Write a protein that binds this ligand. Structure first.
Ligand SMILES: COC(=O)c1ccccc1C(=O)O
Ligand SMILES: COC(=O)c1ccccc1C(=O)O
Ligand SMILES: COC(=O)c1ccccc1C(=O)O
Length: 295
């Protein structure tokens, strides 16, 4: 409930250049706490907005009967398959799941709602492939932060798009671009994800400031959450995005959606791609236990 000791220690310490610096940070942490070996295959999915690079992770031993489709975070501007490899490799090996890690088109080069369309296309592709992998033809979508946004919106669009989704895993997602929450006010600066950056991400991703109220940008605003896929919503106590994540979990639960909501106390935004924190593996264990309950 106090700030985690290791998190405390960590905090105490151009667009191309910033992407590279973000990527260098991600590599540093993986160099500090190396990921498990895992078999992978690269490929390209043909989407309605063009080819989208993917990487399939194959577990040593398959124990989960649905493919996972994973959408990386990074404010819609940063990140790639490599920045999220540390997380995805452990998800693959710990759950015993095939995982499709997706490189959707980044902003500002591509703008809302291009990545949403891409992410749907990839989920549909995964569902079609699943029987040939000897899996069920219903997928688990997953993502961190901006990727959690994508996972939540894909889940909301699933029925309309005839997309079978068995569950949604939202890791400290962004869900509400319209409302200030107490967490967004109280942890606006100094906890890695900052208000300044969130504003900037919005300027890169969104076409106009009015897009904030679009349900494919702000899924928390959808008035009807009935019949949505079973949900695991993981939040960090000291994350501006905390409150909107918990409120969405609460709304899903009240809508009769099977929902598990976990706040990691003492933690900050981003901890599930920061293997210097033991909590990252604890949260990955949470995922495996949750997925055990899914049919
Ligand atoms: C930077 O992205 C990657 O590391 C990657 C990995 C596998 C397949 C495609 C890509 C890509 O260039 O997006
Ligand atoms: C804020 O959450 C994100 O989507 C993000 C933004 C910038 C840098 C990293 C991340 C992430 O969650 O990895
Ligand atoms: C991590 O993503 C964000 O914080 C974000 C990115 C683009 C547009 C809006 C937001 C937000 O949640 O305010």
């Amino acid at each position: 409930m106090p700030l985690d000791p290791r998190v405390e220690q960590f905090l105490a310490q151009s667009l191309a250049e910033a992407r590279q610096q973000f990527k260098q940070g991600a590599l540093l942490l993986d160099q500090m706490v190396p990921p498990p070996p895992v078999d992978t295959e690269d490929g390209t999915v043909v989407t309605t907005h063009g080819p989208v690079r993917i990487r399939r992770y194959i577990p040593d031993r398959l124990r989960f009967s649905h493919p996972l489709v994973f959408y990386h975070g990074g404010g819609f501007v940063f990140g790639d398959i490599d920045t999220h490899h540390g997380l995805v490799a452990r998800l693959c090996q710990t759950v015993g799941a095939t995982v499709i890690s997706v490189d959707y088109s980044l902003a500002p080069e591509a703008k809302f709602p291009v990545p949403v369309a891409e992410c749907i296309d990839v989920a549909r592709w995964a569902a079609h492939e699943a029987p040939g992998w000897g899996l069920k033809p219903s997928i688990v979508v997953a993502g961190d932060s901006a990727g959690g946004n994508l996972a939540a919106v894909v889940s909301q669009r699933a029925k309309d798009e005839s997309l079978p989704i068995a569950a949604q895993l939202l890791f400290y997602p962004a869900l509400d671009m319209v409302h200030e929450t107490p967490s967004k006010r109280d942890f606006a600066r100094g906890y890695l994800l900052e208000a300044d950056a969130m504003q900037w991400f919005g300027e890169q991703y969104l076409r106009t400031p009015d897009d904030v109220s679009h349900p494919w940008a702000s899924p928390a605003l959808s008035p009807d959450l009935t019949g949505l896929p079973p949900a695991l919503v993981i939040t960090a106590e000291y994350d501006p995005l905390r409150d909107e994540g918990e409120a969405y979990a609460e709304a899903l639960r009240a809508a009769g959606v099977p929902t598990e909501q976990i706040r990691f106390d003492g933690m900050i935004h981003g901890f599930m791609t920061m293997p210097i924190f033991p909590q990252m593996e604890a949260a990955i264990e949470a995922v495996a236990r949750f997925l055990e309950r899914i049919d």
